[PDB]
Each structure stands twice: as C-alpha cells, then as structure tokens.
Amino acid sequence: SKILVIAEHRRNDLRPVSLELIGAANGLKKSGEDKVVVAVIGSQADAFVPALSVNGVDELVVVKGSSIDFDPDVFEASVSALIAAHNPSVVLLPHSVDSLGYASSLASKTGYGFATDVYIVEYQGDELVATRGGYNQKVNVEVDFPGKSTVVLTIRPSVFKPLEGAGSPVVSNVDAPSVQSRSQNKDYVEVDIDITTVDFIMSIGRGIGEETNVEQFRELADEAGATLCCSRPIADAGWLPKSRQVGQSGKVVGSCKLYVAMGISGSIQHMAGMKHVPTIIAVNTDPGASIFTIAKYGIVADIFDIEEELKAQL
Amino acid sequence: MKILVAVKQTAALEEDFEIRDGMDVDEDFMMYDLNEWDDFSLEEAMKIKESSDTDVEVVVVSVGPDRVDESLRKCLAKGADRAVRVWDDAAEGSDAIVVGRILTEVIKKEAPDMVFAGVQSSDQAYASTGISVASYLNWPHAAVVADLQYKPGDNKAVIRRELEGGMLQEVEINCPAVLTIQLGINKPRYASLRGIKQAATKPIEEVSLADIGLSANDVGAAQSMSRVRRMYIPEKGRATMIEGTISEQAAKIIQIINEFK
Numbered sequence: 001s002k003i004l005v006i007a008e009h010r011r012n013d014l015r016p017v018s019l020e021l022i023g024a025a026n027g028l029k030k031s032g033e034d035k036v037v038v039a040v041i042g043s044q045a046d047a048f049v050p051a052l053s054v055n056g057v058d059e060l061v062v063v064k065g066s067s068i069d070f071d072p073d074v075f076e077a078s079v080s081a082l083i084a085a086h087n088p089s090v091v092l093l094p095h096s097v098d099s100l101g102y103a104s105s106l107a108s109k110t111g112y113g114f115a116t117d118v119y120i121v122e123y124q125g126d127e128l129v130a131t132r133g134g135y136n137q138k139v140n141v142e143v144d145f146p147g148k149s150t151v152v153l154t155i156r157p158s159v160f161k162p163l164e165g166a167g168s169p170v171v172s173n174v175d176a177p178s179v180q181s182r183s184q185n186k187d188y189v190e191v192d193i194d195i196t197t198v199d200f201i202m203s204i205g206r207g208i209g210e211e212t213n214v215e216q217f218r219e220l221a222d223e224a225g226a227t228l229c230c231s232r233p234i235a236d237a238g239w240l241p242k243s244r245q246v247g248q249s250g251k252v253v254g255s256c257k258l259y260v261a262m263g264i265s266g267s268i269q270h271m272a273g274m275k276h277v278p279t280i281i282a283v284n285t286d287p288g289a290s291i292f293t294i295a296k297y298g299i300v301a302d303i304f305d306i307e308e309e310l311k312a313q314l
Numbered sequence: 315m316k317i318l319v320a321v322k323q324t325a326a327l328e329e330d331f332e333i334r335d336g337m338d339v340d341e342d343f344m345m346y347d348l349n350e351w352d353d354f355s356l357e358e359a360m361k362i363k364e365s366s367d368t369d370v371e372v373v374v375v376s377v378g379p380d381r382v383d384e385s386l387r388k389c390l391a392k393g394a395d396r397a398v399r400v401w402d403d404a405a406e407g408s409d410a411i412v413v414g415r416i417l418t419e420v421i422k423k424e425a426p427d428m429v430f431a432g433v434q435s436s437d438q439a440y441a442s443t444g445i446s447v448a449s450y451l452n453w454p455h456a457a458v459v460a461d462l463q464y465k466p467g468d469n470k471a472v473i474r475r476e477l478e479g480g481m482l483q484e485v486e487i488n489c490p491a492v493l494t495i496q497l498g499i500n501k502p503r504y505a506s507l508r509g510i511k512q513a514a515t516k517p518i519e520e521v522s523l524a525d526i527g528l529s530a531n532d533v534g535a536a537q538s539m540s541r542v543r544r545m546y547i548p549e550k551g552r553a554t555m556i557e558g559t560i561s562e563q564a565a566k567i568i569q570i571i572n573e574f575k
C-alpha cells in the first residue's frame with residue numbers, strides 16, 4: 001500500500017495545506033509498513049524539495065510540467081500518471097481553489113471513488129469511511145466507497161495537523177506528460193486602509209440587511225474601539241471595501257484576540273479566516289447557525305437591539 | 315451563438331429538522347430555491363446577450379424532478395430564452411459525477427458555444443459537477459471565475475480566477491469552454507412584473523434519460539462514486555449561551571469587551 005499526496009504551491013511558496021495532508025495521510029495508513037508518496041508539480045518544482053522533505057514522506061516525486069503554477073490540463077495529466085505508476089489505495093488533494101479545477105476531472109474519467117471537502121477520515125477494517133458536510137453544514141454525511149481500488153479525496157484545509165520534524169523521502173523525477181494545455185496562465189492581479197491584522201474586531205454579515213444599516217454598526221465599532229469587518233456578502237455588494245473581508249478569500253485575522261460576529265452564520269470559508277480567534281462572541285437569531293459551534297459565548301437575538309444599547313451603555 | 319447555463323435547485327432545512335432512516339433528512343423540513351451561485355452565472359450569460367449586437371441564445375438546464383420547474387420558471391423570468399429539465403426517477407440520489415454525465419448528454423444535443431456552472435451548490439457544496447461536465451465533454455475549463463472577457467464567436471477568452479487570501483489570476487482559455495462562476499462577478503437582476511408574466515406563458519421542456527441515450531443503468535446512487543452510509547447532526551459546541559434581556563446580553567458583551575482591554 002501507498003497513499004498519494006499532491007502538494008500545492010503558488011508563486012514560489014509552498015502552501016501550508018501540503019503539510020496538513022501529509023499529516024492526514026500518516027494518521028490514516030493502517031500499517032507502518034505502508035508508504036506515503038508525495039508529488040509536487042511544476043516547471044520549477046525542484047525548489048520545493050528542502051521544504052517537502054519532512055517527517056512522514058516516504059518518497060518525493062518532482063514533476064516538471066509545462067507551467068510554473070497550477071494549470072488544470074497539466075495537473076490532471078500528472079496525477080493520472082502518478083496514480084498509474086503508484087496504484088495508491090487513496091489519493092489526497094487539498095480541497096482548494098486549484099484542486100477545484102481538476103479533481104473531479106480525474107474521478108470522472110475512470111471509476112475512481114470520489115469525495116470532497118472531507119473533514120474526518122478513517123479506516124474500519126479493510127473499509128475506508130469519509131465524512132463531509134450536508135445541507136449546508138447542518139448535518140454530517142458519512143460515506144464509503146464500495147468496490148474502489150483507488151479513492152480520491154479532497155481534504156478540508158486546517159482540519160488535519162501537520163507533523164513536527166525533518167525526514168528523508170527517496171526523491172525522484174518524472175516529466176509531466178507532454179500536454180498541450182488549452183489554457184495559458186497570465187498575470188497575478190491585486191484589486192491603503194488597515195491590514196485587518198489588529199486586536200479587536202466587530203464583524204457584520206448578511207444579517208444586517210441594507211446598506212443603510214452599516215453606518216450604525218460602523219459607529220458601534222468606532223465607539224467600542226473595534227475594527228469594522230465583514231463576511232463576503234457585504235463586500236461583494238460593495239458596502240465595505242474588500243480590505244475588510246474576513247475569510248478564505250480575504251484576510252485571515254491573525255492577531256485578533258477578540259471577534260464579535262454579528263449576523264454572520266459561520267460559513268466554512270468565513271471560519272477559515274477567523275476560527276482561531278481565542279474569544280469569539282456570536283450574535284445570531286438562528287440557534288443552529290454554525291458560527292455558534294466555535295464561538296465561546298453565544299447570544300441569540302436581533303442584531304439591531306443588541307446594537308443600540310451596547311451603543312447606549314458605552 | 316448559445317450559452318447553456320446549468321442550474322440546481324437546492325434544499326435548505328428549517329430549524330429542528332430531524333432524520334428519517336438514518337440515511338437522509340426528512341423530506342418535510344426542506345425549502346427549495348435556485349442555487350445562490352446560479353444567479354451570478356445566469357446573469358453572466360444575460361450580461362453577454364445584452365452587450366453584443368449579435369443574436370445569443372441563453373438556455374438553462376436542470377437535472378431534477380418537477381419541483382424544479384419553479385426555479386426554471388424564475389430563470390425564464392430573468393431573461394433566459396429556453397429552459398429544459400432532465401429527469402427520471404431512476405436519477406434520484408445521483409452524485410456530482412453522475413449529474414456530470416447526464417448534463418453532458420443534454421449539452422451534446424444543445425451544442426452550445428460556452429457552458430456556465432456554479433463554483434458549488436449551497437446544499438451539498440460538492441464543488442465538482444461543472445468541471446465534471448468539462449471532463450465527459452472534453453472541453454477546456456476553469457473553476458472559480460471572478461471576471462470573464464469574452465465576445466460571442468471569439469475563440470480564446472480571458473478569465474480571472476479568484477485565489478485564497480485574495481489575489482486574482484488571469485488565464486486565457488480556449489472556447490468552447492466550461493467555467494464555474496463565483497459570487498460577485500456581477501449584480502444579478504430582479505425580474506420585472508412583466509418578466510414574471512410573460513415567463514408564465516413559456517414552456518419548461520421535459521427531457522427523459524432515453525432522449526439522451528441514457529438508462530436506469532447509467533444513473534442514480536447506485537453508479538455514484540461514494541455511497542452514503544448515514545447522516546447525523548453534529549454536536550454543536552462547547553460555548554456559553556447568554557440568556558436574559560438586551561440589557562444583560564449586552565451588559566455581558568461589554569464585560570467581556572472590558573475584560574479584554
């Protein structure tokens with residue numbers, strides 16, 4: 001047995017989730033006799049071998065492709081060929097924006113067992129069982145893969161712990177398949193204020209309603225010493241600038257010691273940017289809103305009367 | 315020119331839903347609507363039809379049973395030209411890879427020049443179908459597109475994908491292509507009362523699995539790539555509720571706030 005991990009990197013830095021999957025992998029394999037192969041794909045992919053060379057990796061495959069960074073044609077080709085050349089029982093991808101661009105391609109093209117954004121993984125006997133969400137993280141769905149020599153899972157980021165230490169994979173090289181990709185990467189693009197890396201935050205979500213309602217949570221925040229922030233919808237609508245979006249695609253509020261989430265439900269991608277704050281207060285009218293399940297204190301109530309009165313005592 | 319937009323009617327549960335038996339939530343606690351992503355994706359196609367002095371055909375297509383007609387009617391009303399619903403009871407419980415297949419055979423008949431899909435659905439959040447379509451079809455693809463630069467008939471197209479921590483990356487892609495559209499690429503419209511009304515005269519077009527060359531044997535949970543073993547509600551938290559008044563709930567927040575300064 002082998003477990004195939006595929007790493008992830010962008011613009012020359014190895015993305016942390018890579019190290020998380022090795023973790024996953026290692027905590028999964030049934031006998032320490034089983035190996036864990038890790039591949040890394042890119043025209044300058046070499047650079048990474050020092051960083052990839054770490055506890056848990058038995059083999060490191062470096063795959064020189066046509067492009068520097070992710071490209072769905074190149075990636076599906078390479079992983080297909082590694083799958084062929086290693087016949088893993090289980091191949092693990094980071095459930096990430098790159099992965100979204102190819103992973104389901106793989107699974108479709110042959111019979112592979114397939115499951116995505118999985119956050120618990122384990123064997124029971126000779127039988128792989130995986131757990132992901134349902135009905136908008138209102139339930140867990142526990143699934144299995146009858147019949148499946150090989151199962152491909154995309155893994156949620158920040159669920160699995162990486163290992164401490166250095167190691168010594170056998171390192172190897174392949175050429176990616178010769179693939180004449182049907183898309184071509186161009187420029188990376190960015191579109192003052194603060195960097196919401198900072199102490200105390202008040203963060204509004206859809207919960208608030210209408211652009212006119214922001215001024216009073218802007219004012220609430222001014223008056224507690226809080227920095228106004230928000231979930232994605234507020235910024236999509238253009239009501240606060242994209243600088244103030246917490247989340248998987250906005251900023252991760254690293255030095256936040258206090259975070260009050262008002263009218264934010266706690267989507268997966270919001271938690272991504274804030275799940276590690278030590279004190280999280282959540283105010284929300286819907287008692288089963290996911291945000292409550294990582295808060296320390298919860299209030300169930302309208303954000304509007306919690307607002308005034310706060311703004312009234314302060 | 316023709317743009318096919320694939321759309322999903324998704325379920326939300328009400329508070330205090332429960333479970334069968336074991337293997338799903340109770341059919342009663344679900345409310346149906348058009349997947350949030352699909353608004354932006356259909357808007358994007360209408361945005362193309364709108365901007366070009368040539369004729370463009372937007373058609374929406376759904377794999378679902380007939381509670382879905384109601385969502386298709388909404389697409390109709392928001393500008394879409396034609397609407398098609400694929401169904402057989404056999405199809406029930408098909409995961410994203412099977413829906414991929416069913417969508418493909420419809421897309422092979424329609425012959426469109428571009429296909430849009432949603433980054434994900436809000437219920438199952440699989441984030442896999444659209445790209446799966448890309449695969450059976452063998453078309454070029456991109457997932458998670460925040461901006462599209464395309465003119466009907468062009469043969470390359472410049473998109474921007476939205477990456478983690480914020481950045482965007484442009485990518486030039488050949489067309490025909492599939493792309494899965496992200497929230498925020500645009501501000502989708504609301505139907506007008508006239509829209510609602512004319513749409514009420516349109517047909518939603520029924521297509522069965524045999525019409526696309528498929529049978530009981532190609533679809534539904536049995537030919538999916540994952541089998542449900544069971545669902546369950548997760549225990550939800552170790553957190554402290556505060557009960558009582560505004561003056562109190564708020565008095566507490568202010569204690570905590572102050573405990574931190």
Ligand SMILES: Cc1cc2nc3c(=O)[nH]c(=O)nc-3n(C[C@H](O)[C@H](O)[C@H](O)COP(=O)(O)OP(=O)(O)OC[C@H]3O[C@@H](n4cnc5c(N)ncnc54)[C@H](O)[C@@H]3O)c2cc1C
Nearest residue numbers: 205206207231232247248249263265267284285286302303
């Ligand atoms: C690839 C991708 C990237 C993403 N990136 C991000 C990201 O960076 N950041 C992000 O935030 N999301 C992100 N998401 C978007 C995400 O899926 C959700 O759509 C979003 O996080 C939901 O925002 P919300 O919780 O404010 O809205 P909702 O999910 O609509 O929740 C609103 C909440 O307010 C509550 N409420 C309503 N009225 C009141 C009231 N009067 N008093 C108290 N509570 C009230 C409701 O109970 C509800 O729980 C991303 C999604 C995708 C797939």
Ligand SMILES: Nc1ncnc2c1ncn2[C@@H]1O[C@H](COP(=O)(O)O)[C@@H](O)[C@H]1O
Nearest residue numbers: 320321377431432434435440441442443
């Ligand atoms: N059953 C379906 N019928 C039509 N389109 C669908 C269906 N399921 C998924 N889709 C497409 O899949 C998208 C993304 O959600 P996901 O099911 O997470 O892959 C939706 O926006 C639709 O484009």
